[PDB]
Amino acid sequence: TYHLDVVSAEQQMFSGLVEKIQVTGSEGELGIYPGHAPLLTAIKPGMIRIVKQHGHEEFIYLSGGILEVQPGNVTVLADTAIRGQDLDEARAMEAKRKAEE
Amino acid sequence: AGAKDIRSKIASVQNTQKITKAMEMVAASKMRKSQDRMAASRPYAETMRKVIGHLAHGNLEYKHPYLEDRDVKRVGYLVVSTDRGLAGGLNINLFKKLLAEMKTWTDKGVQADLAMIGSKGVSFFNSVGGNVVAQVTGMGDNPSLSELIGPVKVMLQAYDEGRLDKLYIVSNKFINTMSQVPTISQLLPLPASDDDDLKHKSWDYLYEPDPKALLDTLLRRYVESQVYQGVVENLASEQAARMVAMKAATDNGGSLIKELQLVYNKARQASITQELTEIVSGAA
Amino acid sequence: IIYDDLSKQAVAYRQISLLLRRPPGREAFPGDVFYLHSRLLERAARVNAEYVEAFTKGEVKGKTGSLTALPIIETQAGDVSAFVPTNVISITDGQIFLETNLFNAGIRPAVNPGISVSRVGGAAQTKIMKKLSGGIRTALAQYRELAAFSQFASDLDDATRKQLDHGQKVTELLKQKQYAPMSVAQQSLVLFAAERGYLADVELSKIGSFEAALLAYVDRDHAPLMQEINQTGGYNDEIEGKLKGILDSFKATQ
Amino acid sequence: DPLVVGQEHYDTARGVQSILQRYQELKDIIAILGMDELSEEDKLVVARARKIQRFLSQPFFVAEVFTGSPGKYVSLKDTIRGFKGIMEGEYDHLPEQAFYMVGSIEEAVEKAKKL
Amino acid sequence: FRDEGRDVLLFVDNIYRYTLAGTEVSALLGRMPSAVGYQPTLAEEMGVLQERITSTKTGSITSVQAVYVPADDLTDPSPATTFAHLDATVVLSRQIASLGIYPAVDPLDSTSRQLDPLVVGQEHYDTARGVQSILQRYQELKDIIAILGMDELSEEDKLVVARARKIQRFLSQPFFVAEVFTGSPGKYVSLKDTIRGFKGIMEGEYDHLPEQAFYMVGSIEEAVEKAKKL
Amino acid sequence: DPLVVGQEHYDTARGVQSILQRYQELKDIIAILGMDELSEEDKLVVARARKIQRFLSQPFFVAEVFTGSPGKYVSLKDTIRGFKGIMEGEYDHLPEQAFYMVGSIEEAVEKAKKL
């Protein structure tokens, strides 16, 4: 079957051969099977669930990321957080005021 | 008071020497752990680089502000620095190289501003008086990308709105255990040389929802990964520099101890001789 | 026999010599100050059975005799290079260094290992104590170096962490209250507990209470074994198994 | 010794002695390497020891000519309770100067508020 | 014994106590003391004893003297006077005895001023200097091994580490008087045999033998025999 | 004394004395931790003190048989002007060796061109 990778910029989360997966695509829930055509999509926060070789069930929660598919390879480029709120612009203000004070 | 205090000074120097000897080994172990983290970091970045290369240099070629060349009117940097002392001259070397390049760009009349990681850079560039737009401190060991999301977000906002035309990351590189080098490398626009392929973009990816938004998110995640990797490598270089500095400090203490002991022995002999001359003279 | 403050005897002899106008030596002590302490301390000795038999005109035959001397010397400021301290160091068979820094610290007995030494060594020691004490010796030897790493021991090899938390607990165990001597059975029991790793899960703050509870338990339920140990001081598998049973049974309590 | 002073006084005195002894060692590291190199527990020990060191001070009303401040008299029990409180966490938040030449612990908080 | 024509060994159990006894006698006689309080005749009293220990045409007397340093101060007048007569120094360390190596002689601090090409010949000099440099290099590399691990070590430094371990274990030797301890018969090794063995170890022959084949073995010709059954 | 020598000479001498005292104070830290640990003003103090120490050297006419280089005669005006210039930082761009064994500050800048 295909070889599933789950990785982040900080760490490798999972690696192994996988028979099928369930993953929440950008526009809706998606299932991947061996020999799937090349596909690229972001993934919304939630559970991605996996069956390894011999159909052993594995569940992984993701804050988000990008899912893509290649011949024999599935790679999930997960990230730490949603990041959509952009509250850290406030964090950048104090760096300026403390430099001015 | 050679008979009174020099004996205490010798003991204090001995204790300090033993403490530095312990610190050298602690730094050497932390360097190995940082090396493991650094080696773990790379494959995610290289895979995302492969995907962005496929999207950019495919048969159909897209254009994006983060990718296209733009003329220079403002230049930006983000700089990583240690939050703890020792570690030799790493920070000062990096800061003076950054100042050299900043002065070169100033001479062309190009306004510059800095994003700052670590308090040492904050303090040095506040003393210099360079424009610092963003700061983050207090990662220590095990730094997190989550903290990094901020400054890169604001630097991106500056770049894409026209406020910034080029972006550089300033960090030291862990060449190996024995050697480290301060370096500056470009982030925006995408400097990576072009590549060519056939399999990719022939058996092209199905795009959901559309190829462009995925390219924007992909580029943002890529530059974020680049700065995280730079931070980790700078931390490893800091650990190596601290190990070296502690070795030097231990050797210096060991060299000081013997000279103090020679002086103490001279004083010890002199006191005995003087007091015995006094005793003999007093027996008139 | 215990001589309290041999330095005071040396001071008195110096006074006597100077009042008699005898030539002074280093630090105003007379020339034969070493002879004074040497001929005194050399009397402490063990004599063979034949000397005893000859002296007593054959009335005592099978017994050897001995005189053990514990002289006391006061160093002024931790200086062992003074005159009388140097002479007494050169004469005696061993040294028990008491340290003021350790006394200020929690370890009341204040005996400093690594500098204290007994040249007689294991011959003076009973079989069980000789068997057990090597673990303590090596544990403290290892613990001394790691004390530098104690400040930042959070990032260490787990082996080094175990060595450090074992040396610390042994040092905490060695402290003892004044006027409370422990029989050879009790010292051997607590040393067995420390060496065989039974203190591995006990907290540093609670070592003393563990020791007291163990001593009370063995005094209550297993007095004959303590009697045999005090009578013979022997060691063998039949004794180690009994001690293992003692410690396993106690560890269920407290 | 416990037979005279009772166990409370003996334990308090031994605790103070041990804490000051530890601080005397830690100060050597601090002097050259700086305080950041210590363990956080060693930092806490340094802080509380530096507090105790100042708390031992006391104005005498036979020295008002020198200091210009009123003298203080303290009972044994209050001294024991104050040193116990400083050895524990009760007063970690007060500054070092809050104890200097104060008197009883019950008024060090007042100087801290005044400081 | 020398006048009979033999070669004699004279053991002095503490020369320092001889110096102290001379100081006490001079103080009793009431002579004026000298620097650090020693007798004014210290140098001549030392020379009188030491100068009689020499090699005469009829025979020679050789001396092994235990030395004590009063305060670990090598500048003290007693060590300063004693060292002026010593031809060689042998240092015993408990650290080597911890490794089970006997005799526990430190090869890096023990020195002899006979170790010169004009005295012992070029081959002996070169072998001794090579052994010393290899052991010093090993002592340097042990710090690297401890601080960073064996991976840092190049393949050339691994070779010198293995050779240094084999040399450091070859120095062991069973004594005829220590048979009750080791339970092995003592061995006598001539100078040429040990010279040839160490020269061989350094030059890279016998490199293939296990390190334990050198421990307490004797000569190299016995080391190859021990390896055959080890 | 400012009355006899005048104010400028007095101020230059005391400035040199203070700079060298500060260097002596820093040298104990420099010996152990190295120069890198110093603050940026302390490093400037060290750099100026070393230049001052070098500038105090002078080739003697009687020493030509030793050094070989010709001797120099230096006026009081030139030495006070040079030391005041060094302390003001006018010559901070020159290397230390530029000041070694030079008669006057102009000779120091001339030596700097060839290092």
JSON list of N, CA, C and O in Angstrom, two decimals, chain B residues 176-213:
[
{"chain": "B", "resi": 176, "resn": "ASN", "atom": "N", "xyz": [29.52, 22.39, 12.12]},
{"chain": "B", "resi": 176, "resn": "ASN", "atom": "CA", "xyz": [29.92, 21.17, 12.80]},
{"chain": "B", "resi": 176, "resn": "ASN", "atom": "C", "xyz": [30.08, 21.51, 14.28]},
{"chain": "B", "resi": 176, "resn": "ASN", "atom": "O", "xyz": [29.74, 22.61, 14.72]},
{"chain": "B", "resi": 177, "resn": "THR", "atom": "N", "xyz": [30.60, 20.56, 15.05]},
{"chain": "B", "resi": 177, "resn": "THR", "atom": "CA", "xyz": [30.83, 20.82, 16.47]},
{"chain": "B", "resi": 177, "resn": "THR", "atom": "C", "xyz": [31.89, 21.89, 16.67]},
{"chain": "B", "resi": 177, "resn": "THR", "atom": "O", "xyz": [31.75, 22.75, 17.54]},
{"chain": "B", "resi": 178, "resn": "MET", "atom": "N", "xyz": [32.95, 21.86, 15.86]},
{"chain": "B", "resi": 178, "resn": "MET", "atom": "CA", "xyz": [34.10, 22.73, 16.11]},
{"chain": "B", "resi": 178, "resn": "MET", "atom": "C", "xyz": [33.95, 24.12, 15.52]},
{"chain": "B", "resi": 178, "resn": "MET", "atom": "O", "xyz": [34.61, 25.05, 15.99]},
{"chain": "B", "resi": 179, "resn": "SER", "atom": "N", "xyz": [33.11, 24.30, 14.50]},
{"chain": "B", "resi": 179, "resn": "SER", "atom": "CA", "xyz": [33.08, 25.57, 13.79]},
{"chain": "B", "resi": 179, "resn": "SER", "atom": "C", "xyz": [31.65, 26.03, 13.55]},
{"chain": "B", "resi": 179, "resn": "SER", "atom": "O", "xyz": [30.76, 25.22, 13.26]},
{"chain": "B", "resi": 180, "resn": "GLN", "atom": "N", "xyz": [31.43, 27.34, 13.69]},
{"chain": "B", "resi": 180, "resn": "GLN", "atom": "CA", "xyz": [30.16, 27.98, 13.39]},
{"chain": "B", "resi": 180, "resn": "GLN", "atom": "C", "xyz": [30.44, 29.27, 12.63]},
{"chain": "B", "resi": 180, "resn": "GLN", "atom": "O", "xyz": [31.48, 29.90, 12.82]},
{"chain": "B", "resi": 181, "resn": "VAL", "atom": "N", "xyz": [29.50, 29.66, 11.78]},
{"chain": "B", "resi": 181, "resn": "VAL", "atom": "CA", "xyz": [29.67, 30.86, 10.96]},
{"chain": "B", "resi": 181, "resn": "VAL", "atom": "C", "xyz": [28.43, 31.73, 11.02]},
{"chain": "B", "resi": 181, "resn": "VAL", "atom": "O", "xyz": [27.30, 31.23, 10.91]},
{"chain": "B", "resi": 182, "resn": "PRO", "atom": "N", "xyz": [28.58, 33.04, 11.21]},
{"chain": "B", "resi": 182, "resn": "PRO", "atom": "CA", "xyz": [27.44, 33.95, 11.04]},
{"chain": "B", "resi": 182, "resn": "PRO", "atom": "C", "xyz": [27.12, 34.12, 9.56]},
{"chain": "B", "resi": 182, "resn": "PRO", "atom": "O", "xyz": [28.02, 34.31, 8.74]},
{"chain": "B", "resi": 183, "resn": "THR", "atom": "N", "xyz": [25.83, 34.04, 9.23]},
{"chain": "B", "resi": 183, "resn": "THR", "atom": "CA", "xyz": [25.41, 34.13, 7.84]},
{"chain": "B", "resi": 183, "resn": "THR", "atom": "C", "xyz": [24.13, 34.96, 7.73]},
{"chain": "B", "resi": 183, "resn": "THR", "atom": "O", "xyz": [23.36, 35.10, 8.68]},
{"chain": "B", "resi": 184, "resn": "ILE", "atom": "N", "xyz": [23.93, 35.51, 6.54]},
{"chain": "B", "resi": 184, "resn": "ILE", "atom": "CA", "xyz": [22.70, 36.20, 6.18]},
{"chain": "B", "resi": 184, "resn": "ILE", "atom": "C", "xyz": [22.20, 35.62, 4.86]},
{"chain": "B", "resi": 184, "resn": "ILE", "atom": "O", "xyz": [22.97, 35.50, 3.90]},
{"chain": "B", "resi": 185, "resn": "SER", "atom": "N", "xyz": [20.92, 35.26, 4.81]},
{"chain": "B", "resi": 185, "resn": "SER", "atom": "CA", "xyz": [20.33, 34.67, 3.62]},
{"chain": "B", "resi": 185, "resn": "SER", "atom": "C", "xyz": [18.95, 35.27, 3.38]},
{"chain": "B", "resi": 185, "resn": "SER", "atom": "O", "xyz": [18.26, 35.66, 4.32]},
{"chain": "B", "resi": 186, "resn": "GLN", "atom": "N", "xyz": [18.57, 35.34, 2.11]},
{"chain": "B", "resi": 186, "resn": "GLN", "atom": "CA", "xyz": [17.32, 35.98, 1.72]},
{"chain": "B", "resi": 186, "resn": "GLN", "atom": "C", "xyz": [16.13, 35.04, 1.89]},
{"chain": "B", "resi": 186, "resn": "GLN", "atom": "O", "xyz": [16.23, 33.84, 1.64]},
{"chain": "B", "resi": 187, "resn": "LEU", "atom": "N", "xyz": [15.01, 35.61, 2.32]},
{"chain": "B", "resi": 187, "resn": "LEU", "atom": "CA", "xyz": [13.74, 34.90, 2.39]},
{"chain": "B", "resi": 187, "resn": "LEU", "atom": "C", "xyz": [12.74, 35.38, 1.35]},
{"chain": "B", "resi": 187, "resn": "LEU", "atom": "O", "xyz": [12.21, 34.58, 0.58]},
{"chain": "B", "resi": 188, "resn": "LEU", "atom": "N", "xyz": [12.48, 36.69, 1.30]},
{"chain": "B", "resi": 188, "resn": "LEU", "atom": "CA", "xyz": [11.57, 37.27, 0.34]},
{"chain": "B", "resi": 188, "resn": "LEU", "atom": "C", "xyz": [12.31, 38.29, -0.51]},
{"chain": "B", "resi": 188, "resn": "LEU", "atom": "O", "xyz": [13.04, 39.13, 0.04]},
{"chain": "B", "resi": 189, "resn": "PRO", "atom": "N", "xyz": [12.16, 38.27, -1.84]},
{"chain": "B", "resi": 189, "resn": "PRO", "atom": "CA", "xyz": [11.40, 37.26, -2.60]},
{"chain": "B", "resi": 189, "resn": "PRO", "atom": "C", "xyz": [12.10, 35.90, -2.61]},
{"chain": "B", "resi": 189, "resn": "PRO", "atom": "O", "xyz": [13.26, 35.82, -2.22]},
{"chain": "B", "resi": 190, "resn": "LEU", "atom": "N", "xyz": [11.39, 34.87, -3.04]},
{"chain": "B", "resi": 190, "resn": "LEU", "atom": "CA", "xyz": [11.92, 33.51, -3.07]},
{"chain": "B", "resi": 190, "resn": "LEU", "atom": "C", "xyz": [13.18, 33.46, -3.92]},
{"chain": "B", "resi": 190, "resn": "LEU", "atom": "O", "xyz": [13.12, 33.60, -5.15]},
{"chain": "B", "resi": 191, "resn": "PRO", "atom": "N", "xyz": [14.35, 33.25, -3.30]},
{"chain": "B", "resi": 191, "resn": "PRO", "atom": "CA", "xyz": [15.60, 33.26, -4.06]},
{"chain": "B", "resi": 191, "resn": "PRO", "atom": "C", "xyz": [15.92, 31.95, -4.75]},
{"chain": "B", "resi": 191, "resn": "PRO", "atom": "O", "xyz": [16.83, 31.93, -5.59]},
{"chain": "B", "resi": 192, "resn": "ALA", "atom": "N", "xyz": [15.24, 30.86, -4.40]},
{"chain": "B", "resi": 192, "resn": "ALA", "atom": "CA", "xyz": [15.64, 29.53, -4.83]},
{"chain": "B", "resi": 192, "resn": "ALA", "atom": "C", "xyz": [15.75, 29.45, -6.35]},
{"chain": "B", "resi": 192, "resn": "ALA", "atom": "O", "xyz": [14.89, 29.94, -7.08]},
{"chain": "B", "resi": 193, "resn": "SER", "atom": "N", "xyz": [16.83, 28.84, -6.81]},
{"chain": "B", "resi": 193, "resn": "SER", "atom": "CA", "xyz": [17.04, 28.65, -8.24]},
{"chain": "B", "resi": 193, "resn": "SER", "atom": "C", "xyz": [15.96, 27.75, -8.82]},
{"chain": "B", "resi": 193, "resn": "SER", "atom": "O", "xyz": [15.40, 26.89, -8.13]},
{"chain": "B", "resi": 194, "resn": "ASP", "atom": "N", "xyz": [15.66, 27.96, -10.09]},
{"chain": "B", "resi": 194, "resn": "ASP", "atom": "CA", "xyz": [14.63, 27.19, -10.77]},
{"chain": "B", "resi": 194, "resn": "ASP", "atom": "C", "xyz": [15.06, 25.74, -10.93]},
{"chain": "B", "resi": 194, "resn": "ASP", "atom": "O", "xyz": [16.24, 25.39, -10.90]},
{"chain": "B", "resi": 195, "resn": "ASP", "atom": "N", "xyz": [14.06, 24.88, -11.11]},
{"chain": "B", "resi": 195, "resn": "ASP", "atom": "CA", "xyz": [14.27, 23.46, -11.35]},
{"chain": "B", "resi": 195, "resn": "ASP", "atom": "C", "xyz": [13.29, 23.01, -12.42]},
{"chain": "B", "resi": 195, "resn": "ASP", "atom": "O", "xyz": [12.33, 23.71, -12.75]},
{"chain": "B", "resi": 196, "resn": "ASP", "atom": "N", "xyz": [13.54, 21.82, -12.97]},
{"chain": "B", "resi": 196, "resn": "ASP", "atom": "CA", "xyz": [12.74, 21.31, -14.07]},
{"chain": "B", "resi": 196, "resn": "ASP", "atom": "C", "xyz": [12.38, 19.86, -13.79]},
{"chain": "B", "resi": 196, "resn": "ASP", "atom": "O", "xyz": [13.13, 19.12, -13.16]},
{"chain": "B", "resi": 197, "resn": "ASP", "atom": "N", "xyz": [11.21, 19.46, -14.28]},
{"chain": "B", "resi": 197, "resn": "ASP", "atom": "CA", "xyz": [10.71, 18.11, -14.07]},
{"chain": "B", "resi": 197, "resn": "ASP", "atom": "C", "xyz": [9.67, 17.80, -15.14]},
{"chain": "B", "resi": 197, "resn": "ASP", "atom": "O", "xyz": [9.12, 18.71, -15.77]},
{"chain": "B", "resi": 198, "resn": "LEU", "atom": "N", "xyz": [9.41, 16.51, -15.32]},
{"chain": "B", "resi": 198, "resn": "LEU", "atom": "CA", "xyz": [8.39, 16.05, -16.25]},
{"chain": "B", "resi": 198, "resn": "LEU", "atom": "C", "xyz": [7.24, 15.37, -15.53]},
{"chain": "B", "resi": 198, "resn": "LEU", "atom": "O", "xyz": [6.08, 15.73, -15.77]},
{"chain": "B", "resi": 199, "resn": "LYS", "atom": "N", "xyz": [7.52, 14.40, -14.66]},
{"chain": "B", "resi": 199, "resn": "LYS", "atom": "CA", "xyz": [6.48, 13.68, -13.94]},
{"chain": "B", "resi": 199, "resn": "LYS", "atom": "C", "xyz": [5.52, 14.65, -13.25]},
{"chain": "B", "resi": 199, "resn": "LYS", "atom": "O", "xyz": [4.29, 14.54, -13.40]},
{"chain": "B", "resi": 200, "resn": "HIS", "atom": "N", "xyz": [6.06, 15.59, -12.49]},
{"chain": "B", "resi": 200, "resn": "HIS", "atom": "CA", "xyz": [5.24, 16.62, -11.86]},
{"chain": "B", "resi": 200, "resn": "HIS", "atom": "C", "xyz": [4.65, 17.55, -12.91]},
{"chain": "B", "resi": 200, "resn": "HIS", "atom": "O", "xyz": [5.31, 17.90, -13.89]},
{"chain": "B", "resi": 201, "resn": "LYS", "atom": "N", "xyz": [3.39, 17.93, -12.70]},
{"chain": "B", "resi": 201, "resn": "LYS", "atom": "CA", "xyz": [2.63, 18.86, -13.53]},
{"chain": "B", "resi": 201, "resn": "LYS", "atom": "C", "xyz": [2.21, 18.22, -14.85]},
{"chain": "B", "resi": 201, "resn": "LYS", "atom": "O", "xyz": [1.45, 18.81, -15.62]},
{"chain": "B", "resi": 202, "resn": "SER", "atom": "N", "xyz": [2.71, 17.01, -15.11]},
{"chain": "B", "resi": 202, "resn": "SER", "atom": "CA", "xyz": [2.12, 16.17, -16.15]},
{"chain": "B", "resi": 202, "resn": "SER", "atom": "C", "xyz": [1.02, 15.31, -15.55]},
{"chain": "B", "resi": 202, "resn": "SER", "atom": "O", "xyz": [-0.12, 15.33, -16.01]},
{"chain": "B", "resi": 203, "resn": "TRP", "atom": "N", "xyz": [1.36, 14.53, -14.52]},
{"chain": "B", "resi": 203, "resn": "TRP", "atom": "CA", "xyz": [0.36, 13.89, -13.68]},
{"chain": "B", "resi": 203, "resn": "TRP", "atom": "C", "xyz": [0.01, 14.84, -12.53]},
{"chain": "B", "resi": 203, "resn": "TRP", "atom": "O", "xyz": [0.24, 14.57, -11.35]},
{"chain": "B", "resi": 204, "resn": "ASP", "atom": "N", "xyz": [-0.56, 15.98, -12.92]},
{"chain": "B", "resi": 204, "resn": "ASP", "atom": "CA", "xyz": [-0.68, 17.14, -12.06]},
{"chain": "B", "resi": 204, "resn": "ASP", "atom": "C", "xyz": [-1.62, 16.87, -10.89]},
{"chain": "B", "resi": 204, "resn": "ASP", "atom": "O", "xyz": [-2.50, 16.00, -10.94]},
{"chain": "B", "resi": 205, "resn": "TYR", "atom": "N", "xyz": [-1.43, 17.64, -9.82]},
{"chain": "B", "resi": 205, "resn": "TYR", "atom": "CA", "xyz": [-2.27, 17.55, -8.64]},
{"chain": "B", "resi": 205, "resn": "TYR", "atom": "C", "xyz": [-3.65, 18.12, -8.92]},
{"chain": "B", "resi": 205, "resn": "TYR", "atom": "O", "xyz": [-3.79, 19.18, -9.54]},
{"chain": "B", "resi": 206, "resn": "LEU", "atom": "N", "xyz": [-4.68, 17.41, -8.47]},
{"chain": "B", "resi": 206, "resn": "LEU", "atom": "CA", "xyz": [-6.00, 18.01, -8.40]},
{"chain": "B", "resi": 206, "resn": "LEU", "atom": "C", "xyz": [-5.99, 19.07, -7.31]},
{"chain": "B", "resi": 206, "resn": "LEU", "atom": "O", "xyz": [-5.53, 18.81, -6.19]},
{"chain": "B", "resi": 207, "resn": "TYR", "atom": "N", "xyz": [-6.49, 20.26, -7.62]},
{"chain": "B", "resi": 207, "resn": "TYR", "atom": "CA", "xyz": [-6.41, 21.40, -6.72]},
{"chain": "B", "resi": 207, "resn": "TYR", "atom": "C", "xyz": [-7.78, 21.68, -6.10]},
{"chain": "B", "resi": 207, "resn": "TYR", "atom": "O", "xyz": [-8.76, 21.88, -6.82]},
{"chain": "B", "resi": 208, "resn": "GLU", "atom": "N", "xyz": [-7.82, 21.70, -4.77]},
{"chain": "B", "resi": 208, "resn": "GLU", "atom": "CA", "xyz": [-9.03, 22.05, -4.04]},
{"chain": "B", "resi": 208, "resn": "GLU", "atom": "C", "xyz": [-8.66, 23.07, -2.96]},
{"chain": "B", "resi": 208, "resn": "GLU", "atom": "O", "xyz": [-7.75, 22.81, -2.15]},
{"chain": "B", "resi": 209, "resn": "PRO", "atom": "N", "xyz": [-9.33, 24.23, -2.91]},
{"chain": "B", "resi": 209, "resn": "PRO", "atom": "CA", "xyz": [-10.35, 24.65, -3.88]},
{"chain": "B", "resi": 209, "resn": "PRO", "atom": "C", "xyz": [-9.77, 25.11, -5.22]},
{"chain": "B", "resi": 209, "resn": "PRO", "atom": "O", "xyz": [-10.37, 24.86, -6.26]},
{"chain": "B", "resi": 210, "resn": "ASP", "atom": "N", "xyz": [-8.62, 25.77, -5.19]},
{"chain": "B", "resi": 210, "resn": "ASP", "atom": "CA", "xyz": [-7.99, 26.29, -6.39]},
{"chain": "B", "resi": 210, "resn": "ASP", "atom": "C", "xyz": [-6.49, 26.40, -6.12]},
{"chain": "B", "resi": 210, "resn": "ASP", "atom": "O", "xyz": [-6.07, 26.53, -4.97]},
{"chain": "B", "resi": 211, "resn": "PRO", "atom": "N", "xyz": [-5.67, 26.35, -7.17]},
{"chain": "B", "resi": 211, "resn": "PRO", "atom": "CA", "xyz": [-4.21, 26.31, -6.95]},
{"chain": "B", "resi": 211, "resn": "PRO", "atom": "C", "xyz": [-3.63, 27.55, -6.30]},
{"chain": "B", "resi": 211, "resn": "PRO", "atom": "O", "xyz": [-2.53, 27.47, -5.74]},
{"chain": "B", "resi": 212, "resn": "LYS", "atom": "N", "xyz": [-4.31, 28.70, -6.36]},
{"chain": "B", "resi": 212, "resn": "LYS", "atom": "CA", "xyz": [-3.65, 29.93, -5.92]},
{"chain": "B", "resi": 212, "resn": "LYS", "atom": "C", "xyz": [-3.63, 30.07, -4.41]},
{"chain": "B", "resi": 212, "resn": "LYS", "atom": "O", "xyz": [-2.57, 30.34, -3.83]},
{"chain": "B", "resi": 213, "resn": "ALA", "atom": "N", "xyz": [-4.77, 29.89, -3.74]},
{"chain": "B", "resi": 213, "resn": "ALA", "atom": "CA", "xyz": [-4.80, 30.01, -2.29]},
{"chain": "B", "resi": 213, "resn": "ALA", "atom": "C", "xyz": [-3.87, 29.00, -1.63]},
{"chain": "B", "resi": 213, "resn": "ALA", "atom": "O", "xyz": [-3.20, 29.32, -0.64]}
]
